[PDB]
Amino acid sequence: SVENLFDTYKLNDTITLKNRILMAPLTRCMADANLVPTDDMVAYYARRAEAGLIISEATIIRPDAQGYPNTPGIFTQAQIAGWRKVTDAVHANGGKIFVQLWHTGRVAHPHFFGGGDVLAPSAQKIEGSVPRMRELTYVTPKAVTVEDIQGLVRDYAKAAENVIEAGFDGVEIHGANGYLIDQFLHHDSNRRTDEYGGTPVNMSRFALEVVDAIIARIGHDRTGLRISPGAYFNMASDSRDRVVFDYLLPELEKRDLAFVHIGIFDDSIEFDYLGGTASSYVRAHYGKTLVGVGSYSAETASKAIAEDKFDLIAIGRPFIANPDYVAKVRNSEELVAYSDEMLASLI
């Protein structure tokens, strides 16, 4: 029995979720040429509104954040209007939705933004090329200056303001999966020797500045953060990364965020450097609402939550394969297994 998945969950004084099931953020690359959410996207999100909370696909804060085709933005008025259709539809269907705010850092590609500079903490290129594209090899980033950083913080904050204009319930800051914020938090990507590198406090500085700027614009109750203490996507591991997160997590707790959310694909994986699974590491160092994710069935998620491993469960691939995931779980119906083939279709 997975009855606990359908508990009401009070995130905070502003937001109460009707159940513990979140739709995980899932890039689909289906926005229009202007990076505006389409009416097909509106329908896609609207039909998943039985989720306690939807986290949107990663949404770029400005043009030089783009690293994949057709990923929506929220920096133009047209994008705001397109997103307003999405949020209105979700709300009309009895749901709630946060936008996931994205900058890809060294994983951006200049093909998407007129040949400009790719930005990152340090000039450390990742291997390979953009997936599902013809020969877009990743490039050596420019190490951002402190002035670049100030502009990036500003643009995260402005994006957050725009999110509220677009009618979202809040923001999940994308601090995970090897993208810009995560790049500051790991030694592979952050080789800086200024106030944004070297020490745990310094490496955490960018993440905390973005969090604080966004809170100052839209409020802590409407601000969550996704993190990846375990390196796994476009990120080489480093035994020293753990102490950065040892510092970051208590600092994050001071901000009384709506939630912290793990970024991983299979949370049953144990990380040597974390002394166990990603969620268990975070749970041991962070005492507020935690969203678990990664290869959980409704059954294993229910048990984890019962055992106080985390509080909310994000579901990704099964929500792609089953738009009616929540109803099927509620009624013990057969779930279709996800296959990569399903990404071609937006249903």
Binder of residue 107, out of ligand 8K6, ligand FNR, none (CB less than 5 to 8 A by kind)? none
Residues in CB range of 105: below 8 A, 6 or more apart: 118, 119, 120, 121, 141, 179, 180, 181, 182, 183, 189
Contact residue for ligand FNR among 97, 107, 159, 176 (CB under 6 A): 176
Catalytic residue among 179, 247, 296, 325: 179
C-alpha distances (whole Å) from 81 to each of 153, 170, 333 are 23, 16, 37
Binder of residue 174, out of ligand FNR, ligand 8K6, none (CB less than 5 to 8 A by kind)? ligand FNR
Q: Residue 295, annotated ligand binder?
A: yes
Bridge partners of 173? 101, 225
Position 265 contacts ligand 8K6 (CB under 6 A): yes
Instruction: Identify residue 203 by its one-letter amino acid code.
Output: M
The CA-based dihedral angle spanning residues 266, 30, 152, 121, taken in that order and rounded to the nearest 10 degrees: 50
Q: Residue 100, annotated ligand binder?
A: yes
Q: How many helices (H) and strands (E) does the chain have?
A: 10, 14
Contact residue for ligand 8K6 among 233, 236, 251, 324 (CB under 6 A): 233
Position 128 contacts ligand 8K6 (CB under 6 A): no
Q: How far is the CB of 195 from ligand FNR (least distance, A)?
A: 27
Position 37 contacts ligand FNR (CB under 6 A): no
Reply yes or no on whether 196 is catalytic.
no
Query: Which residues are known catalytic residues?
Result: 179
- Positions touching ligand FNR (CB under 6 A) are 24-27, 57-58, 100, 174, 176-177, 226, 263, 265, 293-295, 315-318, 343
Question: Residues marked as binding for FMNH2?
Answer: 25, 27, 58, 100, 226, 295, 316-317
